[PDB]
Each structure stands twice: as C-alpha cells, then as structure tokens.
Structure 1
Amino acid sequence: ILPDSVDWREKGCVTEVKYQGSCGACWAFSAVGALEAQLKLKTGKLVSLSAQNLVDCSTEKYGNKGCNGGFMTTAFQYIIDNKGIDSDASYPYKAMDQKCQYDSKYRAATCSKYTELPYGREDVLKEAVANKGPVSVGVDARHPSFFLYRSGVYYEPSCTQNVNHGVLVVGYGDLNGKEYWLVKNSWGHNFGEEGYIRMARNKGNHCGIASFPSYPEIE
C-alpha cells in the first residue's frame, strides 16, 4: 500500500524553483533536484546544488553537451566519479557553457549509486516517488501547450513517449478525478503553478513521463 498522494515539498526535500534561461540544462537541474532531496533525507540540510557544476564538468565522457542537453543518469555517475558536487551558492548558474571549475572546498553533496526504472512503468515510478524520494524523468515537452501551461492537470493528445526535456517528479495525487504527477520544472516561478506542472498520471505513459526515470542515493 502506497499513500494516496505524495508531496515532497511538504517534507522539506525540495529547493526553490530555478530558471534555466536559454541554456538546455534541464537535465542538470533534474539531476541536482533529485540529489538535493537525498541530501536532505540523509543529513537534515536542504542545500541547492550546482547545476552549473554538471553543465561545465559532466561533459563528453558522460555523453553530455552542457547547454545542448544531457542525461540525468550520467550526471549521477559524474558525481559518483568526482566524489562530490559544489553548492549552487559557490558555483552559480550562468546559463552558458563554461570551463569546469569544480572546487572541493565548496563540496556540498556526494552520490554513491543510482537506479534506473523500467520503461513506461508508472506503477514502478509511483513506488519510487513514495518510498525513495523525488525521481528524475524525461518528458516530451515539445508542444505549445506545455510552454503555455498555467494550471490544473496537463494533458496533450499529441504527446509522445519520446523524451526531450528533463524534470523532477516530486509527488503525485488526484485533482477532482484527474490523476497526476507533480513535476518541478526549471523555467522559473513564472511557469505553471509557481514553477510546477501537474502532468496526467496513469494515462498510458503520457508524454513519456515514465519512459526513462532515475534517482540517486547517498551512502
């Protein structure tokens, strides 16, 4: 039995919404948001982690291309290999590709492992969001309805299961009969419901939300 609804924001495991600007660093934002939750669960401290560190440092060896896109899984692998990631404060986001400037003097978190969930399985995603923490996922965001979303449960009949934008599932629920995933985006507070979008849940892997989910853990 899983809870009927989950909201990790209420358990203090979610940092302020970030603003990626012109740079396709959604994957980095998704990755740090997932690790921020684990850091809080382990240490009690909620600390924004450096998306810029990932953009600049988890690069070709990780199949990542900074502002041109990347993968949350290989971002986790970089944090494992690197033995750390800097705080956002120390290594701020600039919405552009820079030289790697990782400095262990400002290490704010580590990662020991990550787990990838099976393709399209919204049940397995629900279990992880309930039992483990916020989960990094991709979605198909290439529709004007997504960009223009303001409120309620988002459903786009033209959506596909092929992902192109990284976001973070921080919960799930039901809004007057419409089941949803509660998603933290990185398009600032101006987007959606103060930075969040509620996306259709149990609607055949809508927009690919359960196509490629993953989450990190800290030893």
Structure 2
Amino acid sequence: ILPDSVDWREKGCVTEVKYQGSCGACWAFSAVGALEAQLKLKTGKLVSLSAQNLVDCSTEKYGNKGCNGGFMTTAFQYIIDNKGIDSDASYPYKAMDQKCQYDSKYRAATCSKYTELPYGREDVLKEAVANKGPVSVGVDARHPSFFLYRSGVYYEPSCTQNVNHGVLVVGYGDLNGKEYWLVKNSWGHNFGEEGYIRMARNKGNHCGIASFPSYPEI
C-alpha cells in the first residue's frame, strides 16, 4: 500500500527552484535535485549541489554536451566516477559552458549508484517517489501549452512519449480527483506554480513522464 499523496518539500528534501537561463542544463538540474534529496536523507543537511559542475565536467566521456543537452543517468555516473560533486555555493551556476573546475576540497556529496525504472510504468514510478525519494524524469515539453502553463493539472492532447526536457518529480496527488505528478522545473520561480508544474498522472504515461525515470543513492 502506498500513500494517496506525497510532497517531498514537506520533508525538507527539496531546495529552492533554480533558473537555467539560456543554457540547456535541464538534465544537470534534474540530476542534482534528485541527489540533493538523498543527501538530506543521509546527512540531515539540505544543500544545493553544483549543476555547473555537471555542465563543465560530465561532458564528452558521458555523452553530454553541456548547454546543448545531456542525461541525468550519465551525470549520476560521473559523480560516482569522480568520487564527488561540489556544492552550488562553491561552484556557482553561470548558464554557460566552462572548463571543468571541480575540486574535491569543495565536495558536498557523493553517489554510489543509480537506478533506471522500467519504461512507462507509472505504478513503479509512484512507488519510487513514495519510498525512495524525488525521481529524475524526462518529459515532452515541446508544446506551447507547457511554456504557457500557469496552474492546475497540466494535460496536453498533442503530448507524446518522445521526451526532451529533464525535470524532477518531487511528489504526487490529486486535484479534485484529477491525479497528477508534482514536478520541479528549472525555469525559475516565475514559471507555472512558482517553479513547479503538476502534470497528469495515470493518463497513459502522459508526455512520457514515466518513460525514463531514474534516481541516485548515496
């Protein structure tokens, strides 16, 4: 049995909403967001981790292209391989590609492994969000309705399972029956519901939200 609703923000495991700007670092923000929750669960400290660190260092060897896109899974592997990731405070976000400047003296977190959930299974995603923590996912955000979203449960008839935008599921619930996934975006606090968007849940893997989910562990 799983809870009917979950919101990790209530558990102090979600940091402030970030603004990626003109740099396509959605994947980096999604990855750090997922790890930030695990760091809190392990150490009791809520610390924003360096998305810039991923943009600058989890590059070609990880199939990533910095401000031109990347993967949350390979970002997690970089953190594992690198034996650490710096704090956002020590390695701030500049919304541009930079030479890798990682330094272990600024290490704020580590990662031991990551898990990729089975394709399109919203029930498995629900269990992971309830029992493991926030989960990194990809969604189809190639529709004007996504950019124009303001509030309520988002549903786009033209959505597909071809995802292109990396975000973070930090909970789930229902708005007057309409089930949804609580998503933390990285487009600033002025987007949607102050940085978040509630997306249709149990509506046939709407916008591919359950297509490629993954979460790290410490």
Shorter chain as denominator, the TM-score bin is over 0.9
Q: Distance between the aligned counterparts of 1:155 and 1:22, measured in 2? A: 26
Q: Any idea what the Cα deviations from partners look like across 1:79-123, whole Å, max 9, x if unmatched?
A: 000000000000000000000000111100000000000100000
Does 2:93 align with 1:99?
Answer: no
After TM superposition, give the deviation of residue 38 of structure 1 in Å.
0.0
Q: Does 1:48 align with 2:62?
A: no
Task: Output one character per residue of 1:124-153: Cα deviation in whole Å (capped at 9) or x when no partner.
Answer: 000000000000000000000000100000
* Per-residue CA distance 1:48-94 (angstroms, 9 max, x = gap): 00000000000011000000000000000000000000000000000
Tell me how far apart the structure 2 counterparts of residues 88 and 94 of structure 1 sit (CA, whole Å).
Answer: 11
Does the alignment pair 1:71 with 2:71? yes
SS in 2 for 1:171: strand
Unaligned runs of 5+ in 2: none
Gaps of 5+ in 1: none
- 2:86 corresponds to which residue? 86
Question: Superposition RMSD on alpha carbons, in Å?
Answer: 0.3
CA positional deviation for 1:177: 1.1
> Hey, which bits of structure 1, 4+ residues long, moved more than 2 A?
none
Q: Using structure 2 for the length normalisation, give the TM-score.
A: 1.00
Alignment of 1:119-198 (within 5 A): 119-198=119-198
- 2: distance between equivalents of 1:88 and 1:98? 15
Secondary structure of 1:138's partner? strand
Deviations 1:154-177 (A, max 9, x none): 000000001100000000000011
Alpha-carbon distance in structure 2 between the residues aligned to 1:102 and 1:18: 20
Q: Which residue of 2 aligns with 1:213?
A: 213
1:181-219 alpha-carbon deviations (Å, 9 max, x no partner): 00000000000001000000000000000000000000x
CA distance in 2, matches of 1:60, 1:172: 35
Give the secondary-structure state (helix, strand or coil) at the position aligned to 2:47.
coil
Q: Does the residue aligned with 2:3 lie in a helix, a strand or coil? A: coil
C-alpha distance in structure 2 between counterparts of 1:11 and 1:63, whole Å: 34
